[model samples]
Target: FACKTANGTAIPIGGGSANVYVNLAPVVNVGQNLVVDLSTQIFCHNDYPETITDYVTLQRGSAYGGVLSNFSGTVKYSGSSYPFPTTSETPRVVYNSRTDKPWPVALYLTPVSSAGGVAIKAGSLIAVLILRQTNNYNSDDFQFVWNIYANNDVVVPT
Candidate 1:
C-alpha cells in the first residue's frame, strides 16, 4: 500500500499483507537502532484509531521474549518483561529462527487462549522485541528493522 504523509512524502510498501512480506531478513548490528513505524491501514476493521508514532530499538534477547530494547519513554503495553515469555506456553513468546520458514523479526501476538480474552485475534497489535542475532547462540551483534501494524478497534483516521 502507498501512504503520503503531510509533507508529501510517500511510502510505497506495495498493497495488502502478502505484497510486502519479507522473510528471513538480516539483522542490524548491536548498539544500533531499528526504527519501527506503526500504521493503521492494517486494522481497517477496527473501531478506534491506532498508531505507534515513535521509534523503538531492538533489544538483545535474554530468554525468548524476555529481552527488551530500552526506550526514552514508556508505552501502554510496555511492561517490565515479555508479555509472553516462554516457548512451550502458547500465546507466550517464542523465537522462530529464519531457518524455519522465517517469521516476522518478532511476533507481537502468539496463539493461545487466556481467561480474560487476552487471546490475540487477527487484528490485535502488540510490542515485539528482536535479538541482535539468531538463537542467542552467537555473540556477533547486529541490527534489524520491524514494522508495526494496528489492530482492529485500535486505529483511528487522521
Candidate 2:
C-alpha cells in the first residue's frame, strides 16, 4: 500500500495492494538517542517534492486499535528536527512540508541517553508507524517495523 510519493498517483510499493513495510535495521547503540532516517527508503517525486506529505501513527501491534503511545521523538523534516513535548498524547501526527526535499528524513527517539526518553528494548516488536496519505486519494496505510538490538545489529537488505 506504500507509494513513492505520499499521494496515490505514484507507483505503489510491491506493485499491488500489498502492505509496504520498511525494517529499521542496525541495532542503534543505546549510548545516545538514535535518529532513524527514512528518506532513502521512501523517496518523494523528484519534480514535485512538496506533494510528498504524510501522517504517522505509532502503535504496538498490527491488529485493529492497537495500544498507542505518545512516543518521545523528534521528527526531522526539511533540514531540521523538532522534539515532541514531554507530556504528549497518542496518535501524534507529524507533517513534513519539505520544499527542498532532503535525501532522507528521520525520527530521533530519546531516553537511550536521557532520563525522560522512551526505551526500545532489544528483540522488541515495535510497530512504529501506520502511514497515511495527506494529499492522496487511495488512503492506504503503510506499516513499519523496528527490530531493536543493544549490541549486535544487522544491515538493512538491499
Candidate 3:
C-alpha cells in the first residue's frame, strides 16, 4: 500500500486505507548509493563577447547537500570555426550508514565577464559565431560539448 498523499501528511491505515509501504519508498541499504548521469553541448552566441565558465553541482535535502566536485575550463574564439573545449569529469557519492536516504545531484553552467559573473543553467551550451564577430569584432565564437557518466558499482543496494 503506497502512500500517495503529500509529504508530512498523516496517511490513514488498516480500513483498506492507503499507507506507506517498504517497497514504495526508494530505499537504499547501509552501503548502497544512488547514481545519476548528465551531459550537454552548448554553443555561445557571438553577441556575448566575454569569457565564460561552466559548473556542475550535486545536492540533496539535508542528506547530500554539498559540493560533489567541480571542473573549470576556458572558451576560445576562432574566426572561421568556433572552438570550445570539452570537459568530462566524474563525481562520486558515499552514502551515510546512519541515514537511509538517496542523495540527489545537479549540474549548472556560468558565464563571466569584466563586469561580473552571470550564472546560467540551461542556455550556456551553445554560442553563435557570427554574432560574436559582429559584437566583439573578432569574427569568432565559442562552442562546447560536455558528457557525464555514472559508475554502476559506485552505489549498491544490499
Candidate 4:
C-alpha cells in the first residue's frame, strides 16, 4: 500500500491479486492525516501495457466487503490528483462519500485521455487521496480494513 498516515503506512499485497494488491493496514492516530499515493511501483517486474485512463476505486470495511462503522474523517481537497490529459490539465477532483456514512468510504478515480489512453511511467503520480480524522476515537482504536479496485490495471506500461 502506498498510503501513509503520519509515521504509519501500508504495504504491498501478494497472491490472487497482483500489482493492484496492497495491504493498507496502517496504525494511525485518529485525527492524523492520511496519504494514498499512486506514484510508486509497489509491484512490478519487467514491463506491462497500462494506461493513464484506467480507473480505480477504494472500499473500506470493518471486514472485507463490509462497512466501516466508525470511520470519522474527511477527504482533503488539496494535493490529491488523478490522470492528467496534459501537463497543464487542471487536476480532477476525486469523487467520494461525505464525511459521515454507514457505508464504506468508497471513492472513484479516473484518468482521462482521447487517444485510447496515455501511457504512464513505471511510477506515475496519479490519484492520491488525503484523509484526516476529525477527532480521536475509542482509546484502543480497533483497526479498519479496506480493499482496492484498479480497472483491469497493470503497471510499467510500454
Candidate 5:
C-alpha cells in the first residue's frame, strides 16, 4: 500500500459545510468554519512593475488554533493590456516578540483600488480566509510567509 496514510474527513458527518481544499486536513468540529483561498505564484517567472495599488504582508510560519474572523479579497487582472483594481476587506492577526525568527501571526494586504483604478500589471488573487473551529486539534501544521510591501511599480513587465 506504499505506506499510504490518508485519513481526514469528518466535518460534515451529516449536517453540512465541509468544502476543503488547499492541501487540507479536515476533521473540524467545534464552531465549524474554515475557508481559505489564496493565489499568485509570484508573476509566473518574475519581472514586473506597473501598478496603482496593491500591498502585501503575511506571516504565520507555525502555530494555529483559531481566530481569523473574516477577510475577503479579490483583485485579479493580467490581461487585456493588464488592468487591476478591486477592494472590500476584513483582516486582523498580528503579534511580535522582538528577536530573531519572530512570526506569531500577521497578515496585512491591500488589494487594489476601490474606485476607477485598474493598474497593476502582474498581481492577481482572491484572498479569502475565515477560520472558526477550536478546542485544539492535533493538526494545525503551519507555513506562511510573504512580505511584498507594495506590488508592481509602473511599466515594466512582459
Candidate 6:
C-alpha cells in the first residue's frame, strides 16, 4: 500500500471517490495574522489529467454573537496579492486554470470588534474556507473550518 492513515495504517488508494483534501492551522492568536498556504493544504491527487479552475469563498463563524466583523485576510497567487474582507458580502476569489497543479493562496485574520476596533475578545474565532473546482462544466466542492483563539498570550502548538 502506498497510502497510510495519520496513525500509520496503510490503505489502498485506488477506486475511491475523487475529492479535495485540505489542511489548516488549528490554532492562532489574536492580532497575530497567519498565512494559509493553499498549494500545500489543498489538492486533488486521485483525479489526474483533469485540469481544474478553483474558486474560493471565505466566511467567519458565529461564535462571538456578531462581535467579530469583517474577517481580514489576503490572497496571493503566482506573485500577485489581493486584500479581501472575509465577509458574506465579499466576492469569491477565482483562479483560472493554467496547469494541473494547485496554486498557492494566503489567508490572514485580525479580528476586530463590531464597532470597528482592534479590541477582540478572548474566545474561539472561526474562519471557513470553501473551495470549488470546475472541470469541463462539472463541479465539485470542499470546505474547511479554522478554529482560532483571540488571546493576549500566544500559544504555539507543538
lDDT of 4: 0.24
Better of 2 and 5 by TM-score: 2
The residue pairs found clashing in candidate 2 are 39-104, 111-117
The CA lDDT at 53 in model 4 is 19
Task: Score every model by TM-score.
Answer: 0.22, 0.37, 0.16, 0.22, 0.17, 0.39
Off by over 4 Å in 6: 1-33, 46-71, 86-103, 110-125, 137-158
Pairs of residues clashing in candidate 5: 50-153, 50-154
| Per-candidate RMSD, Å | 18.2, 9.7, 22.2, 19.5, 21.1, 8.8
- The prediction achieving the highest TM-score against the true structure is 6
Q: Better model by TM-score, 1 or 6?
A: 6
C-alpha local distance difference test of each model: 0.24, 0.37, 0.20, 0.24, 0.21, 0.38
What lDDT score goes with residue 25 in model 2? 36
lDDT of 4 by residue, 7-72 (tens): 224432221221233323233233332233333322111111131111122221111111012122
Model 5 weakest lDDT span, ten residues long: 40-49
The positional error of residue 111 in candidate 2, measured at the CA in angstroms, is: 2.7
Instruction: After the best TM-score superposition of candidate 6, give how far the Cα of residue 58 lies from its true spot, in angstroms.
Output: 7.7
Give the per-residue lDDT of model 1 (tens digit) for 95-152. 3321211222232322221112222122322343332222233233332322332232
Per-residue alpha-carbon lDDT of candidate 5 for residues 64-150, written as tens digits (9 for 90 to 100): 112111222222221111111122222322212112122122232222222112222223222322222111223322222222211
Candidate 3 stretches greater than 4 Å from native: 1-105, 108-135, 153-158
lDDT of 6 by residue, 56-144 (tens): 44432222321235345565544555554333423445545333344344555444333233333434343333333333334454443
Residue 103 lDDT (model 6) = 32
Candidate of highest lDDT: 6
Query: Model 6 TM-score?
Result: 0.39
What order do you get sorting by TM-score, best first?
Answer: 6, 2, 4, 1, 5, 3
- List where candidate 1 sits over 4 angstroms from the true fold: 1-100, 104-125, 134-140, 154-158
What lDDT score goes with residue 59 in model 5?
16
Model 1 alpha-carbon miss at residue 56, Å = 19
Scanning candidate 4 in windows of ten residues, the lowest lDDT window is 59-68
State residue 110's C-alpha deviation in candidate 4, in Å.
23
Tens-digit lDDT string for candidate 2 (54-82): 55443322211100132346655446444
